[PDB]
CSV table of C-alpha atoms (C1' of nucleotides) in Angstrom, one decimal:
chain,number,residue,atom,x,y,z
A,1,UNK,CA,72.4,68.6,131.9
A,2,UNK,CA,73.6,65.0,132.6
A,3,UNK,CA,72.2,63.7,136.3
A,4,UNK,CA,74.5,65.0,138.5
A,5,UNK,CA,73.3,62.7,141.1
A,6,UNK,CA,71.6,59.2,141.7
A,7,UNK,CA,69.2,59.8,144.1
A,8,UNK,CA,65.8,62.3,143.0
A,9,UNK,CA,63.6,63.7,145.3
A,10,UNK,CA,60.2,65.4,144.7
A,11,UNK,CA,58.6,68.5,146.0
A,12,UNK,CA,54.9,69.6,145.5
A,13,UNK,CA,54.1,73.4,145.1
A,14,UNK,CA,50.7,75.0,144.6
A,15,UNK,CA,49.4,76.5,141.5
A,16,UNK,CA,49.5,79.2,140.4
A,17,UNK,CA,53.5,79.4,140.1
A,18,UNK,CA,55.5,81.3,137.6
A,19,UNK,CA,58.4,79.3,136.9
A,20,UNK,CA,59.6,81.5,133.9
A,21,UNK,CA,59.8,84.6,136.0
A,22,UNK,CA,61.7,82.8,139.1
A,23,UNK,CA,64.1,81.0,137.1
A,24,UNK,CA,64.3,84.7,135.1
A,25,UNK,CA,64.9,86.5,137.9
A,26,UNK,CA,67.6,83.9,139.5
A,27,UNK,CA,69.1,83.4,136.3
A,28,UNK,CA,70.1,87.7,136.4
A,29,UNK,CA,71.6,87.1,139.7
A,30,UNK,CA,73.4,83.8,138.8
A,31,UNK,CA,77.0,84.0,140.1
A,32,UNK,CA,79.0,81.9,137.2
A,33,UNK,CA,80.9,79.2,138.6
A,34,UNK,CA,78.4,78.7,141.8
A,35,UNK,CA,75.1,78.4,139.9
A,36,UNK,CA,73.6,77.5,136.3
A,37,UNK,CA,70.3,78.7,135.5
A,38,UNK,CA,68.9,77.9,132.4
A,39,UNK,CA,65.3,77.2,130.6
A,40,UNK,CA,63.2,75.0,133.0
A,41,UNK,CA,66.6,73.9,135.3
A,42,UNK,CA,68.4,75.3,137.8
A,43,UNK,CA,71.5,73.8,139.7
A,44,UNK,CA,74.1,75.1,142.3
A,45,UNK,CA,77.2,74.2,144.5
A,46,UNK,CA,75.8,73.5,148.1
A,47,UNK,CA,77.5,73.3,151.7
A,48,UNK,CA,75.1,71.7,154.3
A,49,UNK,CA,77.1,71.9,157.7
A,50,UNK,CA,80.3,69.5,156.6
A,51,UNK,CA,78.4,67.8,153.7
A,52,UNK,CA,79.3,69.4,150.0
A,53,UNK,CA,77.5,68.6,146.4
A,54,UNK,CA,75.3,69.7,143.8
A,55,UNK,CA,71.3,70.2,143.8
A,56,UNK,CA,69.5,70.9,140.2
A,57,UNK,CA,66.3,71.2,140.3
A,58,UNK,CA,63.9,71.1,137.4
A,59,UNK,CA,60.3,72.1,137.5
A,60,UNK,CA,57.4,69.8,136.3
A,61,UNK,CA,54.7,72.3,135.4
A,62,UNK,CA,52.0,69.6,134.7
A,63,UNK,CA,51.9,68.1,137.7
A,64,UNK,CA,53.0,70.4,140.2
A,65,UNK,CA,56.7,68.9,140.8
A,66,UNK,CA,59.8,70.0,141.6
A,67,UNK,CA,62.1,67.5,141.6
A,68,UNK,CA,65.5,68.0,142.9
A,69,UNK,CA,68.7,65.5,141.7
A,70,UNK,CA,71.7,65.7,144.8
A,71,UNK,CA,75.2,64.8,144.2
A,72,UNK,CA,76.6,61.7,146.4
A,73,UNK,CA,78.1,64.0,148.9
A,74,UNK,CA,74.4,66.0,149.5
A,75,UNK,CA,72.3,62.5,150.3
A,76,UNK,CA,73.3,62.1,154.1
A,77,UNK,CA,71.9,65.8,154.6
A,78,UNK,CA,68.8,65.7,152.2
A,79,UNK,CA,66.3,66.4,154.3
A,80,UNK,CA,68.0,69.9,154.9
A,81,UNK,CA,69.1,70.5,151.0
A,82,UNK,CA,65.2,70.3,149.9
A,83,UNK,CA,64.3,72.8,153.2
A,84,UNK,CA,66.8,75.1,151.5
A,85,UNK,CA,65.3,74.5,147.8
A,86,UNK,CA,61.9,75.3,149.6
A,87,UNK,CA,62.8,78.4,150.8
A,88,UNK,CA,64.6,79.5,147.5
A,89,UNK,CA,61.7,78.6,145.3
A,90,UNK,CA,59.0,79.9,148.2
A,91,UNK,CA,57.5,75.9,147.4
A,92,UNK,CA,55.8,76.3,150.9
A,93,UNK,CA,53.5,79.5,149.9
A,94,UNK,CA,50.0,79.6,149.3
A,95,UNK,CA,49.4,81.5,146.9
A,96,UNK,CA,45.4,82.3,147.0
A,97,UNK,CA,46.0,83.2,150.3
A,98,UNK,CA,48.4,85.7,149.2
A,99,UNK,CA,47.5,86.7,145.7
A,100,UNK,CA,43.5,87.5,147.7
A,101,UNK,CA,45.2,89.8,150.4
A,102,UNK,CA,46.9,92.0,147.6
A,103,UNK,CA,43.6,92.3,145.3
A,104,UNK,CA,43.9,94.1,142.7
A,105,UNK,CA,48.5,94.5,142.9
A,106,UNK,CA,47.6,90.5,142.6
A,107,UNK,CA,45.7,89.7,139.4
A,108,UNK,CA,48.0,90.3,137.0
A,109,UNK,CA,51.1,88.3,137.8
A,110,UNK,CA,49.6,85.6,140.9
A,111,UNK,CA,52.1,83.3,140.0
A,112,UNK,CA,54.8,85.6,141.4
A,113,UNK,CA,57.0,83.9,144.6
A,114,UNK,CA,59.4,85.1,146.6
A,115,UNK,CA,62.9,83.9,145.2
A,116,UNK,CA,64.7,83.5,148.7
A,117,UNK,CA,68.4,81.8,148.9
A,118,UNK,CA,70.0,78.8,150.0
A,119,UNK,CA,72.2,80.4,152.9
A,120,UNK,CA,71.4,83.6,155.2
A,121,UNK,CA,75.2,84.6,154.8
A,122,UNK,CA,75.7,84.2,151.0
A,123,UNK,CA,72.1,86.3,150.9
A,124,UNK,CA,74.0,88.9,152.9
A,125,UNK,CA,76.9,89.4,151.3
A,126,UNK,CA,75.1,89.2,147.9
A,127,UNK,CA,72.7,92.2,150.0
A,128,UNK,CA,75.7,94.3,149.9
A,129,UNK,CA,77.3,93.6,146.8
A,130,UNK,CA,74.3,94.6,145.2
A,131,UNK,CA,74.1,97.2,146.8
A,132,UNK,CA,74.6,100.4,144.4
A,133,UNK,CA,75.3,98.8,141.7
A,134,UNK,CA,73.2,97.1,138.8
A,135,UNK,CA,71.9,93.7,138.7
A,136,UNK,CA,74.7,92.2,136.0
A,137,UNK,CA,77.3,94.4,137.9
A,138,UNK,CA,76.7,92.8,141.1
A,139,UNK,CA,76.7,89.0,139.5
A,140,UNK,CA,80.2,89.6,137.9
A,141,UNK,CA,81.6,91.2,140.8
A,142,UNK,CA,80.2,88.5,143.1
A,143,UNK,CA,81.4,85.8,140.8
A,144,UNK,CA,85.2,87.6,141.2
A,145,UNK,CA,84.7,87.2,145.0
A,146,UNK,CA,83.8,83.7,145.3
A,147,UNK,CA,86.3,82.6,142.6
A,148,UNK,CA,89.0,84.0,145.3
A,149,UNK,CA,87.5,82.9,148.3
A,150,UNK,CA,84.6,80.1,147.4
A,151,UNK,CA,86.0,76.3,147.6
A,152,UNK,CA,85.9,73.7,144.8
A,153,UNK,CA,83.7,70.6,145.0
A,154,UNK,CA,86.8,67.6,144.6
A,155,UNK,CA,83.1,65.7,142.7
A,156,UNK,CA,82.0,68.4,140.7
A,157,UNK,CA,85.0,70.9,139.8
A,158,UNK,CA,83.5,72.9,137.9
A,159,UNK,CA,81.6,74.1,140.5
A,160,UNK,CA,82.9,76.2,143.3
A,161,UNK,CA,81.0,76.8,146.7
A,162,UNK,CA,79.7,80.3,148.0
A,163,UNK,CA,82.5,81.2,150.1
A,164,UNK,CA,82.4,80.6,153.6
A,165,UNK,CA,82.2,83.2,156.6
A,166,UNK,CA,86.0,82.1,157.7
A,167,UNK,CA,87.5,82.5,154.3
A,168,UNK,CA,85.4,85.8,154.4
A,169,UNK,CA,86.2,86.9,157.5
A,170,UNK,CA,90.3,86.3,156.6
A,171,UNK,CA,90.0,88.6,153.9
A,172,UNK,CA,92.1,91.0,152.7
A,173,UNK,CA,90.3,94.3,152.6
A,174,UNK,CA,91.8,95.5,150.0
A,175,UNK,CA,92.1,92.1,148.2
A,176,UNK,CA,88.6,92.9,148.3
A,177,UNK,CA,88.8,96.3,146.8
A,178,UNK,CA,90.9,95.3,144.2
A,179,UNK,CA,88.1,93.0,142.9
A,180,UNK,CA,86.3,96.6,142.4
A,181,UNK,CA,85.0,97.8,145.0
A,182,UNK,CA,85.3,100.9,147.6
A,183,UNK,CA,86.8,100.3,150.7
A,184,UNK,CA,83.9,100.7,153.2
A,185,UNK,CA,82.3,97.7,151.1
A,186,UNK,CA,84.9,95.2,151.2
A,187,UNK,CA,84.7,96.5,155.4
A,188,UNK,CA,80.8,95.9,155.4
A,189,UNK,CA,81.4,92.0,153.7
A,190,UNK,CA,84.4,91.2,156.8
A,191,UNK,CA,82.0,93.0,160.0
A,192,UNK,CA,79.0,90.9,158.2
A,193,UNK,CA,81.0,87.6,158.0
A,194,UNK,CA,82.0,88.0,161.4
A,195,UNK,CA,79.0,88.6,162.8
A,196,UNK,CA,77.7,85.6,161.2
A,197,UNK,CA,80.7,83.3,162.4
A,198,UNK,CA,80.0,84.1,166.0
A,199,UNK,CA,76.4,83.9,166.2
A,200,UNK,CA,75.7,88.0,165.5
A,201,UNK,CA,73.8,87.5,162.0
A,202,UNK,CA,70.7,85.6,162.3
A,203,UNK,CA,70.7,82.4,159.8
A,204,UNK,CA,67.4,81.3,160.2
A,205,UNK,CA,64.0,83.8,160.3
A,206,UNK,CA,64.0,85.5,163.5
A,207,UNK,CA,60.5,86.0,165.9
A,208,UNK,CA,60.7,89.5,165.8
A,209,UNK,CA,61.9,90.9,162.2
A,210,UNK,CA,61.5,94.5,162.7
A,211,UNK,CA,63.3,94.4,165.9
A,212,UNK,CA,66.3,92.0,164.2
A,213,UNK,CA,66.2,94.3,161.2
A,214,UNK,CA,66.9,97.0,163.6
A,215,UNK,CA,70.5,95.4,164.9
A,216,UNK,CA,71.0,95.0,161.1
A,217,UNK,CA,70.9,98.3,160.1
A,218,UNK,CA,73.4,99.2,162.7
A,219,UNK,CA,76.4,97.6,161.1
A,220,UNK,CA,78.3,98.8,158.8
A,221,UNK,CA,77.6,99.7,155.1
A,222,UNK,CA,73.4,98.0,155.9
A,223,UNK,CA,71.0,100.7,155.8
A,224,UNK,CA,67.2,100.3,156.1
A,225,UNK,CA,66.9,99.8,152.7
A,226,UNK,CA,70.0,96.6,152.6
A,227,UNK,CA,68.5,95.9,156.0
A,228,UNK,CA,64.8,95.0,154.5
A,229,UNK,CA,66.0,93.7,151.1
A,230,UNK,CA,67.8,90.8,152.8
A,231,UNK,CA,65.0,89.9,155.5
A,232,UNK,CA,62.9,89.3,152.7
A,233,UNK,CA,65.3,87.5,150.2
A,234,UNK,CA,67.6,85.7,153.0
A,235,UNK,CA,64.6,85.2,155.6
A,236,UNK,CA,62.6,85.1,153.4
A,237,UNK,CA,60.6,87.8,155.8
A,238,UNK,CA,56.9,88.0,153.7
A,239,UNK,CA,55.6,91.2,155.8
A,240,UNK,CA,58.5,93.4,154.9
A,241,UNK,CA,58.2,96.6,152.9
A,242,UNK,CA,60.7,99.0,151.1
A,243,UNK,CA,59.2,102.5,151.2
A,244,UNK,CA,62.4,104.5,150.5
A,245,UNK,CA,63.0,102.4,147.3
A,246,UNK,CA,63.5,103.9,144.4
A,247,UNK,CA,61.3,102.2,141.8
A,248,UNK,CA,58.6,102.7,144.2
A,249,UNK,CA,58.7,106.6,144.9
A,250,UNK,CA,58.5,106.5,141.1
A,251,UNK,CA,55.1,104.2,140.8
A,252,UNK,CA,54.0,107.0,143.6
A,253,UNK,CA,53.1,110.3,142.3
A,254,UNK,CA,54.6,112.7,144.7
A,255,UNK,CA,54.4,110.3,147.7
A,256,UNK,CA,56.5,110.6,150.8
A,257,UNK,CA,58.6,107.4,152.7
A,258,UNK,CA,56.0,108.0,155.5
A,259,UNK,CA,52.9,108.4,153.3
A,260,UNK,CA,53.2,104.6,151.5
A,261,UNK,CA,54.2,103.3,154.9
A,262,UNK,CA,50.2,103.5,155.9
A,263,UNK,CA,49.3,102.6,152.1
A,264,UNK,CA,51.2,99.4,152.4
A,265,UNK,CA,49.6,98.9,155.6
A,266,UNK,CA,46.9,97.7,153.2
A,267,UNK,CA,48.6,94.5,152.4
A,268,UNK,CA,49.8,93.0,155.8
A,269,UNK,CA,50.7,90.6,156.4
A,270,UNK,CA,52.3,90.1,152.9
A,271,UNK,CA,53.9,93.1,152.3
A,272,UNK,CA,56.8,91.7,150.7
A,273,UNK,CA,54.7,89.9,148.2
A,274,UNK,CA,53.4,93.2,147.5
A,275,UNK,CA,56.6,94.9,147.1
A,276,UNK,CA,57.1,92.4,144.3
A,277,UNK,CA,54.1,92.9,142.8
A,278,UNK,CA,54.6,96.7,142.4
A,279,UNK,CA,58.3,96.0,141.0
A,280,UNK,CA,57.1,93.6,138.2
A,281,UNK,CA,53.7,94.6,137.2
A,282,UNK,CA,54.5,97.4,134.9
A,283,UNK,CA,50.9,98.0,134.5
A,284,UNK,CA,50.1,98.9,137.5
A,285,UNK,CA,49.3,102.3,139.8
A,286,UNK,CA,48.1,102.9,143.3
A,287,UNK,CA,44.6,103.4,143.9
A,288,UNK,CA,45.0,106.8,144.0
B,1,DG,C1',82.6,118.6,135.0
B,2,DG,C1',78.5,120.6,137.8
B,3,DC,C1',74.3,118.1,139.1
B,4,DA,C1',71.7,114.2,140.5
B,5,DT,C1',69.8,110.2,142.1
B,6,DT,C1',70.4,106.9,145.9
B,7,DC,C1',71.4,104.6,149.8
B,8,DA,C1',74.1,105.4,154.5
B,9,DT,C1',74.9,108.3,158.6
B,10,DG,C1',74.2,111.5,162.6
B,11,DT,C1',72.1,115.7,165.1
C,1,DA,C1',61.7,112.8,160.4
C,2,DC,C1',65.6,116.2,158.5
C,3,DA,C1',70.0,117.5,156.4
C,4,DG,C1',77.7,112.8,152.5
C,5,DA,C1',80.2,109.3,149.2
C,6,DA,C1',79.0,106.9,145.3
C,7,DG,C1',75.8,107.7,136.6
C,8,DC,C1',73.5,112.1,134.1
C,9,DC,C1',74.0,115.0,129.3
DNA sequence: GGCATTCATGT
DNA sequence: ACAGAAGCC
């Protein structure tokens, strides 16, 4: 909790916002020795290009503030550290423009964002970790995999970074397995961080989603359901939809992954926001 | 254990 | 759209 950093920065977000839920839902996923989520803070190992340090960033409720603290290491590449803070904290959304489109899924939670990630890659192999397993399962196996292949900050050594797509790439397959998991897993992390290390993943938000989400769901191990999960958490994709997912056949009573596609149609374009919704609002049913 | 979600494949 | 490998009681 002691500044990690000299130089502060300052980032504006519009009310409503949520900040218990995000840092909740971040704080589930928090991968041990890479990030620290705690009660209005929130601090992580981070690799811009060559540059390596540590961000925390602590809301300021009152006056709609984020400010964000950087290590010595992060300050020649700031600009770029508080574009990846804004697209993991969704500081850029407009939230009556959103919370309006979805109506009704939108009054009870409006100030629910869209927790995205620091780094397309370390969203997709997270994607697939998480893929069968449960939400702690996935953090704790995640956190064996980057304490094998994630790199120590020589600054801040109790923090090691997300592990890169070369020391993923030069994995052991079964290295991999042995930190529990199936074999066709460990498979789908490698043909991902290959992809990704020549120019085959998408790091930044493609023009055409549906059409990149396609290629996607061709590799390896990444369905349609992996395939939409990380456009909207590692592009942070706000018109995606997950039809065949199961907490949502649940909230719709004898509904088919054809039927919801036209009901969701109802909420472009912020489907993903409206995925969320459904997810998080106990409360709530379709209009039936 | 036989059965079942649950997401990934392939005809 | 239409039929195999990985907790449930």
């Amino acid at each position: 909790m002691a500044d990690i950093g000299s130089e502060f920065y300052t980032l504006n977000w519009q009310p409503p916002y949520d900040w218990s839920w995000m840092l909740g839902f971040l704080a589930a996923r928090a991968v041990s020795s890479v990030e620290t989520v705690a009660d209005s803070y929130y601090a992580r190992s981070l690799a811009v290009g060559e540059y390596r340090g540590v961000v925390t960033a602590i809301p300021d409720i009152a006056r709609h503030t984020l400010h964000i603290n950087l290590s010595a290491g992060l300050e020649p590449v700031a600009a770029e550290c508080l574009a990846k803070m804004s697209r993991l904290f969704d500081l850029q959304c407009n939230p009556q423009i959103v919370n309006g489109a979805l109506g009704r899924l939108g009054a009870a939670r409006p100030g629910l964002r869209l927790p995205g990630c620091v780094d397309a890659f370390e969203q997709g192999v997270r994607a697939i970790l998480g893929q069968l397993v449960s939400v702690a399962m996935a953090a704790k196996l995640t956190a064996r995999v980057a304490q094998l292949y994630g790199e120590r900050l020589d600054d801040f050594p109790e923090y090691i970074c997300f592990p890169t797509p070369q020391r993923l790439a030069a994995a052991d397959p079964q290295a991999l397995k042995a930190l529990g998991m199936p074999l066709k897993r460990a498979e789908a992390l490698i043909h991902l961080a290959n992809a990704a290390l020549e120019g085959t993943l998408p790091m930044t938000i493609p023009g055409d989603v549906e059409q990149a989400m396609k290629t996607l769901q061709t590799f390896p191990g990444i369905g349609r359901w992996t395939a939409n999960y990380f456009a909207l958490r590692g592009w942070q994709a706000k018109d995606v939809f997950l039809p065949d997912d199961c907490l949502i056949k649940q909230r719709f009573p004898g509904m088919t992954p054809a039927q919801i596609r036209r009901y969701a149609e109802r909420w472009k374009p912020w489907r993903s926001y409206a995925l969320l919704h459904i997810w998080y609002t106990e409360g709530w049913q379709p209009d039936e």
